[PDB]
């Protein structure tokens, strides 16, 4: 068999997981009570695919996931909402008090004596899985739970299980927009610990999706329940080869092998095909060439970094729906012919290809439209150094006066732990500046 | 779940907390008996944040009313929401302070702090987890300043990990409802700066000018100002009681709105504030609320923000909204008005959005700000003080109760250093 | 103000550290003090105003105890002789060489005893019958921003250590209410007092080692000068006071490798906060010397508050760090050197 545990951490991850499972249940045929009348009407098939859903003898389907926030105001919606009867009642809140946007309480003061429950449920949900494996952590750089608890959980799972494919679909801080005056510290503090243990972390930024959603979907007044659905579509395009049958499959370790040349440069970007609204679904072809040419378009990128100031170390293209390989190959050749998409000379191959047949679903009451084909890009480029050069500057302004630091030392943390965590990120930036240079023989 | 213990020191504390419980009950659906008479199932899910349960489905608030000289206590019992409070929690002694900080910190405060702290322990140890505390007092006067500061010191000695969030009415520029205001304010600031995490400097002249200009009221009594202050009080601790998209709390606001610990004096504000006729001639949206918020005529501090730079500000929203519009507007405010913002903080704003608005509105916002204009709330106090202390004007009443001049010079020295730490960031760097 | 003088010192390998044959991570090139990891990756450089090398008795510039006194502590007596105050702060973790540096061994004296003996020498040399000299000693500690006295002999009961409090005199400045002060004429007296003080200091048996320190100790001398003989009535008019403050701090002890919980964690927070504010103060004063406009946060802690008339003004200040050259202690060495650099800039 094959399996993938999904862990959600914080209020970013929960609100994302809700959307992801709203999509998964509708893709497979499960309704919120766990049952599946689709099987009872059809009478066969593994459509209740066992990568994400464990199955009891009573016909129920309970999903392989945990989600934690250290404050019950969020998850208690799940213990009251539509998906009450689906998820296991072990949704490990221990939220007597929140992490207050500091890594200091998420890593030690309100972290210790609670993570043991998480690791216990992970042991209980791994021994039920005799198959391919790999974990998906959904968190946000910038919170006290998305930073410290994540850095605490990964440094333990890298002992307990070890040689497994761990992944992180993490929210990223926007340059201008930000809903906190402390994310510059939490970001780099989390990157220090989650740069050795993790294997490939995909990053997404709220500002990019906001700027997309009005340009294409014609929404001038968007919310968090209309970006979290696109995020779920990305996760589904990443996790579909495990579930559905296809012409050319790509599994969890393959993303880790293609897109991570060195151990430390495992932080790529993501895209989809959202030039697709309900009215603009007509008036348009939605071929393979047109959709794949939305890859290199910065207006459709989901992280704020113009790739034209950098080069592509690697790229991966996962296609859903009715797609034929020669269309993908013509797309790749038309891309390589151009000169705006620079490629590192140590990667003439560049691309992966992955094809599956089941098209994406339409989460009803939603913005996206029914399609016959969908595409996802995962791109490791040297441009994102700029997207860090801002953060490491912000640090260097507010760490000059030692500002917002007594709240962190007050919850057990060193004042020399930020100087030691900011001397590693500059080395990473220097690494990106090193690999991007072409060799002179 | 997270919980608060309110204390009510001074007439003002007790004249405001009544109106605050009148607003909490209105939101949570409780009558004077304590009985639930609401409509939705989302008022009782987190009722523990302020109230405790009882036997016959009744709910009793966690109030501790300490006031020397029982005159202002009697008024509550003969009021609308007086018979919901616990009689065991009304703690008062006779012979009131007399607008003396000595007779509310040293003598009678020392008599009546044990009986107060006993009920504090009684209410706190009966909480699952505790976040912090809450106190409403008026500086300048007697009881509310001295006894409040004494309680704060004792409590932060007992429970230092938890928040102590004072909502303090401060002296005014021109009005003087009390003549010994600067001395008591100086001593109270000397006691609050070291022993507080976030306090809010309300001022009465700003509330009058809000009541006259915006609301276009003609006979504004005290209950209307208390109405504005309760409004803010309720909005601060919303994301503990109700859910939303980006939940905040007291400790997130504390970690964010306080770059250094001594600069924990903020300017508040409330927003939708309109007249009875001018509500048909606008449109409630995020930009109108933000414009009403960053205006100098909806802040309660009696300090024009345009005389100093904002170190940090916070906006707690309530209602169905769009985070895109929120962040776009809070970014436009930074990019247009950068001269009023600090440069060593790249983003000076945070946000917080609940999903359940007040009983009869679709949107609501509260605003908080750590600024540098607050100088002119304390510099004046350091000028009134030294004009009086240089001649020993109102002094013998205070030396007569076991005190010295050294304490007064110290307090002056601490307020001036606060003003210096503020002035350090009022010129561009 | 005047230039805060930071200094380092690299102790040699210990006996066990040479028996077990631990490696070497810290190197020096004159002024530069670099740190090369054994096999991982990039080297971090560090530059300071003064550097002391005590690894082996061959190198040019082997800074023994006498050189450490005569380059850092000696001129501070001079300013302590001309009526201006002075402070010397020590910083370092346990196993880094503070007690060997400040106090020392009975055959290898530290900095404190040489300070006191050279003091008494210059006193008795100039001790005419027209210019006298008085000395006054005191010794206290900060524990969770509570000032405790150490000369006070305690009784065998529960909580007996009474916490004294600070007060601001409008003329002299900050001071302590009830801190005993004793006269001194022979360094034997100072030794018999300092041993008694250190035997009472807060020192918990941490899981790493039994002998540590969880409180910041201050050792204050007051040097009073009666240079006054008016030529009209032969009567003392004026009198100079100067303050000398030798301070022994505690370590960072980040609560991460040392899972601490309870009273051993609150001590941590207090120590870290005091170190976070003292470094802030010294940086702000270094900027103040450079003709800029800065505010010195003196009231955010106790030591920064009580030592306020000694740091600023026409004073002169000094700092000594102590770092181990082994490979097991690279994180602590880095945490000390970075702190010292922040004090410098
Ligand atoms: C539909 C409509 O627009 O009627 C409004 C109204 O016309 C106005 C004048 C209301 C009215 O507010 C005032 O009259 C007022 C007078 C002096 C000082 C302060 C307020 C209103 O009374 C107030 C009342 O709002 C509330 O009731 C809130 O729940 C309020 N709580 C209480 O008023 C309350 C109820 C019982 C006991 C104590 C207080 C509240 C405010 C903040 C936070 C939580 C709750 C409402 C809908 C209105 C009237 C009735 C006219 C406004 O009320 C507020 C501050 O929300 C003022 O701005 C709003 C909107 C309007 O301008
Ligand atoms: N895309 C997206 N981002 C979110 C969502 N919810 C929160 N965020 C982002 O995540 C950050 C919020 O910090 P959180 O990580 O939620 O903090 P937390 O994880 O709840 O833990 P605390 O910090 O203790 O509250 C903000 O910067 C938001 O932009 C969401 O539903 N979607
Ligand atoms: N907002 C408001 N302020 C009040 C009220 N009553 C008194 N005050 C303020 O309280 C101050 C006087 O202090 P006071 O509370 O009477 O002293 P105390 O009796 O010793 O607590 C004055 O500056 C008033 O503005 C009230 O009902 N509402
Ligand atoms: Mg949260």
Residue numbers in the entry:
A (entry chain A): 1 to 441
B (entry chain B): 1 to 429
C (entry chain K): 391 to 735
What does the paper say about this structure?
KIF14 is a microtubule-based motor protein with essential roles during cell division. KIF14 belongs to the kinesin-3 family of motor proteins. As all kinesins, KIF14 possesses a highly conserved catalytic motor or head domain that contains nucleotide and microtubule binding sites, and where ATP hydrolysis is coupled to the generation of mechanical work. Here we report the near-atomic resolution structures of twenty KIF14-microtubule complexes corresponding to five distinct KIF14 constructs in four nucleotide conditions mimicking four key steps of the ATP hydrolysis cycle.
Construct K735 comprises the core motor domain and no neck-linker residues. To investigate this issue, we obtained the cryo-EM structures of microtubules in complex with the constructs K735 and K743 that have truncated neck-linkers. We surmised that an absent or truncated neck-linker would mimic the situation when the neck-linker is mechanically pulled out from the docked configuration as it may occur under force or in a two-heads microtubule-bound intermediate. In the Apo and ADP states the motor domain structures are very similar for all the complexes investigated; this is regardless of whether the KIF14 construct contained a truncated or a full neck-linker, they all conform to the open configuration. All the KIF14 microtubule-bound structures in the ADP or Apo states are very similar with the motor domain adjusting to the open conformation. All the microtubule-bound KIF14 open structures have the more twisted β-sheet conformation, regardless of the nucleotide species in the active site. Consistent with the structural results, we found that the K735 and K743 constructs have reduced microtubule-stimulated ATPase activity relative to the longer KIF14 constructs.
